[PDB]
Design a protein around this ligand. Structure first.
Ligand SMILES: *Cc1cc2c(cc1C)nc1c(=O)[nH]c(=O)nc-1n2C[C@H](O)[C@H](O)[C@H](O)COP(=O)(O)OP(=O)(O)OC[C@H]1O[C@@H](n2cnc3c(N)ncnc32)[C@H](O)[C@@H]1O
Ligand code: HEM
Ligand SMILES: CCCCCCO[C@@H]1O[C@H](CO)[C@@H](O)[C@H](O)[C@H]1O
Ligand code: SF4
Ligand code: F3S
Ligand code: FES
Ligand SMILES: [K+]
Ligand SMILES: [K+]
Lengths: 613, 139, 241, 102
């Protein structure tokens, strides 16, 4: 050797990540009596959650009569029927309660004339199960809702005995006989190693938009938690479903909230058309993201792109009252200027679809427990939980509704807190771990620390980011997807020629970024190989060489006298990816989509049907 | 988990015994008019103070009363210029500190805090000082 | 072619280099093949010339507050600070001022963090037996009082720019924290005003502020910590019980 | 009282205002009354003023204690000298008119 010192920690439970999901599960546990430990690689308030703008959905009814079941409906239709409706049941029925909790904590929600929480319009959201017109259930704090939401949560956590370990990098899970014994990590401040023996581990580490070259995500969204599970021999789910947000400013890729269109802002091309009226006669600009992005994409490569390169489009806001802009969208107004010199009251905002959110993630049940799939049956992995963007419950399926992640965060983060609280008891004897538990992680660490090859970290990463960006975008195809696989597989191989320079251990971000590359690559492989395998069009996954959505039945005609297709012959099912770490070979399997709700009498399960906005 | 006080006490405990350097400050920080006028308010205050203290002492210790030292000065037919100057260097600190001193009492009412107002007042203070000095040193 | 080379002098130091001493290192960057922000420049250098150049960063859009540092004399967010087009000037870059340096441009903000904690930056109602049932009522009017106070991102630029902080940083809260102490004093939903003021009854926490105003000038989100501190003082002198 | 700190602050500014209102007085009504009023207001403002400076720059229990004590003497002797000057000599106001007559 041990050329590194190891300190073993003993806790009832361990939380990994301090964004929305993380903080809420962490103090939820301590709030329940357990001796919790929160491990994060960033100071809590620096998490990508703090960058969120638009809002968090809840059927409060502060703007009009609402029904949480209509909210449910929206999300199921939204997920092109790939979302587990039981998960979607819980998420949408707990929402009002989740939001009110936030306001009761301190969240400075913008107010109505009645002294209540202000809600705006957002994409793919209606009343009366898709018949009663546009809805207004996106609770918010101007256009800085993520900022406030995280700042409040961190503030709330300062009230319990939760032990935090900030700027600690998590390496892998402490696995023993199919169960999780904790996690191992590197203390970046003083370069030491740490193993946390706990009866329960919760992972909420974010997504991995940084697998691509153009994303809205932060440089710290490197899917670290996703890779840890993989190295455990556990499957990740639906990683091929990548959401491209419609409005990410040109050049910097920074995000421009959907809230803009929700206040009146529209889309316009070179000639000046509001093309969305053409593609989506009703929803127009408030159609689903997956739908909208393809629309933009088309207008461009088709010839009507804007700018000096005819490569982007225009988001117009200036036709709206200056007061409303300064009151609803003050954030983006300050961003436009600093990154495009645009003044939202005088000129349009240059934008184009940008990698933004990951629908796929570590598979769990509606209780936040991590599951595995063996011989056609899901089975919970004792001691492991997941929530946040790093998880796949999966409330979002093949297309996430705007303002549903921030909701998911708080709802499931608490759920992990509740499930554990009802399952285990604080104080229960912590599991033993073999003396050498984790030496291989250290091993890898040391190897990357003194790496001296031909291809430096910054170069490999840039090769990965450019292949995803070319072989797995809004529109995808078999040949192009096939090449991207070859290209990536080669790069993953070339990682053996990696070269690093910093030979220190304290705040060696040269090293850390190399640990993250291994992480991003794993995520990327499963993404592109899963994409190549899925020959159908569903949500954010459009194959021009397979333009139809293949379900077990053809729901374009009456079901009477129809032959239900075999599991093996249709694609209405989650993807299950596995990776041969040492070689980097992808292995896929598939599991069924959960369509039953938590209670049929209370919330009707919703069957497939044509998906149009 | 540790308390805020437990963290502060341990913060100094670890860093005061490390080999970590202290990032520079005064030597590398950019100045501004407000910032400079701020230090100057303090300097003139201290000087004004010592001045008044140096006066009470001389009163308790010197041999002659004040009237005699005033004569000892007049029987020196000093260049009125040197006279003027001496009067200017006499009332400049007092002048500055007072106007700027007023500026502070206004701030204490929470008015004039916009950064562009801090500059404006700073400059009005600088012209009132000069004008109210030249005048006195000439009377 | 037509490059455009620019020199950056940046502060260095390695805790793992035995007996190493702070020093400046210069780097030349072609502005033609780089982003317009100093952060963009700092990342280019690390990826292509000295991957040992250590520093904090995340969001790259000036909202997480990670890239705080002293760029050309003034504290700011490297991710939203424009690189100077003037090639005749070498831009120096330091860590936040008067801070214990962990490595290169990474300061130790753990006292800053605890200071924040100590003002209890969370809603406290006298009757907390109803937390979770219904929305608390707050009018448009009272909500407006929070504008310019909640936007803070705790970057520590203001506090590390204030001379009083430099001198009594161990007992003086500093602009950041104080403006958040005010953020909860004027929140129409908080019932602990007097207690939050009671806590500032000492020679240091609040009174080390002599209105220098380095804070307001330096804030990246355009906040006015200095004026918030001014209003506290008025409350300190006008409350009772 | 518990509210000591905020009371000191208020008094300071009041005294500041007081001293500012004496300036107009010493030039329009020079005499005993103003003369002594200045000695008092000048000593107090100066006293509280130099203390804030000691507070910012002096650290360590001893130094602190020393600085404050040394300052307490400086003040008391100053108020004393001024009063002496006001009783045994012409007085502050008159001395200025005389200095300025040179
Ligand atoms: C990028 C983005 C996303 C976004 C948005 C605007 C932008 C610019 N606006 C949204 C909105 O208005 N409404 C909504 O519902 N969603 C919106 N999103 C998406 C959403 O914000 C994200 O999906 C969500 O923030 C996910 O957050 P989560 O709680 O899952 O975490 P995180 O914020 O990403 O933070 C990750 C945490 O994990 C820790 N971590 C990561 N790796 C490690 C390792 N290796 N070791 C230890 N800890 C680790 C981080 O420190 C962090 O706390
Ligand atoms: C002659 C005077 C003397 C001997 C004198 C001396 C001083 C001194 C030593 C200080 C403290 C310096 C500091 O805290 O940085 C000070 C501060 C101050 N004085 Fe005077 N002063 C005089 C007249 C005045 C007048 C006429 C006004 C009005 C005034 C207003 C102020 C104010 C408001 C401060 C405090 C500023 C702060 O809070 O930083 N002074 N004075
Ligand atoms: C050390 C004394 C010299 C500094 C005095 C003026 O300094 C100048 O003040 C102006 C006004 O705020 C700023 O805009 C300039 O950048 C600054 O250099
Ligand atoms: S008040 Fe301003 S400078 Fe101070 S920490 Fe907040 S945003 Fe950063
Ligand atoms: S610079 Fe400092 S002294 Fe007061 S006004 Fe700002 S906190
Ligand atoms: S990286 Fe987030 S503030 Fe700059
Ligand atoms: K996900
Ligand atoms: K209040």
């Amino acid at each position: 050797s041990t050329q590194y010192p190891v300190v073993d920690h003993e806790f009832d439970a361990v939380v990994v990540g301090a964004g929305g999901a993380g903080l809420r599960a962490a103090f939820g546990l301590s709030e329940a009596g357990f001796n919790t430990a929160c491990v994060t690689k960033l100071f809590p308030t620096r998490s990508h959650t703090v960058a969120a703008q638009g809002g968090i959905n809840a059927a409060l009814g502060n703007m009009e009569d609402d029904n949480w079941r209509w909210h449910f409906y929206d999300t199921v239709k939204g997920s092109d029927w790939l979302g587990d409706q039981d998960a979607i049941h819980y998420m949408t029925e707990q929402a009002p309660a989740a939001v009110i909790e936030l306001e009761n904590y301190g969240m400075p929600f913008s107010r109505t004339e009645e002294g209540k929480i202000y809600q705006r319009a957002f994409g793919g959201q209606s009343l009366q199960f898709g018949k009663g017109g546009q809805a207004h259930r996106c609770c918010c704090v101007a256009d800085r809702t993520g900022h406030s939401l995280l700042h409040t949560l961190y503030g709330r956590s300062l009230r319990y005995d939760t032990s935090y370990f900030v700027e600690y990098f998590a390496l892998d899970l402490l696995m023993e006989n199919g169960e999780c014994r904790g996690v191992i990590a590197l203390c970046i401040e003083d370069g030491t190693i740490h193993r946390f023996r706990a009866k329960n581990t919760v992972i909420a580490t974010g997504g991995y938009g940084r697998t691509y070259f153009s994303c809205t995500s932060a440089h710290t969204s490197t899917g670290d938690g996703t890779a840890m599970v993989t190295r455990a021999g556990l499957p990740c789910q639906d990683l091929e479903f990548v959401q491209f947000h419609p409005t990410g400013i040109y050049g910097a890729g920074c995000l421009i909230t959907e809230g803009c269109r929700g206040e009146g802002g529209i889309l316009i091309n070179s000639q000046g058309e509001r093309f969305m009226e053409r593609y989506a006669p009703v929803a127009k600009d408030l159609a689903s993201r997956d739908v909208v992005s393809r629309s933009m994409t088309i207008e461009i490569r088709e010839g009507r792109g804007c700018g000096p390169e005819k490569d982007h489009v225009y988001l117009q806001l200036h036709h709206l009252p200056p007061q409303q802009l300064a009151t609803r969208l003050p954030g983006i107004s300050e961003t436009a200027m600093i990154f495009a010199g645009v003044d939202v009251t005088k000129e349009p905002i240059p934008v184009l679809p940008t990698v933004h959110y990951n629908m796929g993630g570590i598979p769990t049940n509606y209780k936040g427990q991590v599951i595995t799939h063996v011989n056609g049956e899901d089975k919970v992995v004792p001691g492991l939980y997941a929530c946040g963007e790093a998880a796949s419950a999966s409330v979002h399926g093949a297309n996430r509704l705007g303002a549903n992640s921030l909701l998911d965060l708080v709802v499931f983060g608490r759920a992990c807190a509740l499930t554990i609280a009802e399952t285990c008891k604080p104080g229960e004897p912590v599991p033993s771990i073999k003396p050498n538990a984790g030496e291989e992680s250290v091993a890898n660490l040391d190897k990357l620390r003194f790496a001296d090859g031909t291809i430096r970290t910054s170069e490999a990463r840039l090769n990965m980011q450019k292949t995803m960006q070319s072989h797995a975008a809004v529109f995808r195809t078999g040949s192009i997807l096939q090449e991207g696989c070859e290209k990536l597989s080669q790069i993953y191989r070339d990682l053996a020629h990696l070269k690093t320079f910093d030979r220190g251990i304290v705040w060696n971000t040269d090293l850390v970024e190399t640990l993250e590359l291994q992480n991003l690559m794993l995520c990327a492989l499963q993404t592109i190989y899963g994409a190549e395998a899925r020959k159908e069009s569903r949500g954010a996954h459009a194959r021009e060489d397979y333009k139809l959505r293949i379900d077990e039945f053809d729901y374009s005609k009456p079901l009477q006298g129809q032959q239900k297709r075999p599991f093996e012959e249709h694609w209405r099912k989650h993807t299950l990816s596995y990776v041969d770490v040492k070689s980097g070979k992808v292995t896929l399997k598939y599991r069924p989509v959960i369509d039953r709700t938590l209670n049929e009498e209370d919330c009707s399960s919703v069957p497939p049907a044509i998906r149009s906005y | 988990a540790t308390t805020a006080k437990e963290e502060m006490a341990r913060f100094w405990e670890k860093n005061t015994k490390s080999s970590r350097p202290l990032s520079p400050h005064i030597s590398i920080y950019k100045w501004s008019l407000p910032m400079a006028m701020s230090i100057t308010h303090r300097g003139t205050g201290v000087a004004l103070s010592l001045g008044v203290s140096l006066f009470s002492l001389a009163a308790l210790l010197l041999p002659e009363q004040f009237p005699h030292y005033v004569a000892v000065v007049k029987s020196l037919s000093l260049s009125p210029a040197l006279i003027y100057s001496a009067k200017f260097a006499l009332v400049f600190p007092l002048s500055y500190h007072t106007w700027n001193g007023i500026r502070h009492l206004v701030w204490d009412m929470g008015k004039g805090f916009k950064l562009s107002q801090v500059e404006q007042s700073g400059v009005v203070v600088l012209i009132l000082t000069l004008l109210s000095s030249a005048a006195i040193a000439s009377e | 072619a037509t490059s455009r080379i620019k020199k950056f002098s940046i502060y260095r130091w390695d805790p793992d280099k035995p007996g190493d001493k702070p020093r400046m290192q210069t780097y030349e960057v072609d502005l033609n093949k780089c982003g317009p922000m100093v952060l963009d420049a700092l990342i280019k250098i690390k990826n292509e010339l000295d991957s040992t150049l250590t520093f904090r960063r995340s969001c790259r859009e000036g909202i997480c507050g990670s890239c705080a540092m002293n760029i050309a004399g003034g504290n700011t967010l490297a991710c939203t600070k424009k690189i100077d087009p003037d090639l005749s000037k070498t831009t120096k870059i330091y860590p936040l001022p008067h801070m214990y340096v962990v490595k290169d441009l990474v300061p130790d903000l753990s006292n800053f963090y605890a200071q924040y904690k100590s003002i209890e930056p969370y809603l406290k109602k006298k009757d907390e037996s109803k937390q979770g049932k219904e929305q608390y009522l707050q009018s448009i009017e009272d909500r407006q009082k929070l504008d310019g106070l909640y936007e803070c991102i705790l970057c520590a630029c203001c506090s590390t720019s204030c001379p009083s902080y430099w001198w009594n940083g161990d007992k003086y809260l500093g602009p950041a924290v104080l403006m958040q102490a005010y953020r909860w004093m004027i929140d129409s939903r908080d019932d602990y005003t007097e207690e939050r003021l009671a806590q500032l009854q000492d020679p240091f926490s609040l009174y080390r502020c002599h209105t220098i105003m380095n804070c307001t000038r330096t804030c990246p989100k355009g906040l006015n910590p200095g004026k918030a501190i001014a209003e506290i003082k008025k409350m300190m002198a006008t409350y009772k019980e | 009282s518990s509210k000591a700190a905020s009371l000191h602050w208020t008094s300071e500014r009041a005294v500041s205002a007081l001293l500012l209102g004496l300036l107009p007085a010493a030039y329009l009504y020079p005499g005993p009354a103003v003369d002594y009023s200045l000695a008092a207001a000048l000593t107090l403002h100066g006293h509280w003023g130099l203390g804030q400076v000691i507070t910012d720059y002096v650290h360590g229990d001893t130094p602190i204690k020393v600085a404050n004590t040394g300052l307490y003497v400086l003040s008391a002797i100053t108020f004393t000298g001024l009063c002496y000057f006001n009783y045994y000599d012409v007085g502050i106001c008159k001395a200025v008119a005389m200095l300025w007559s040179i």
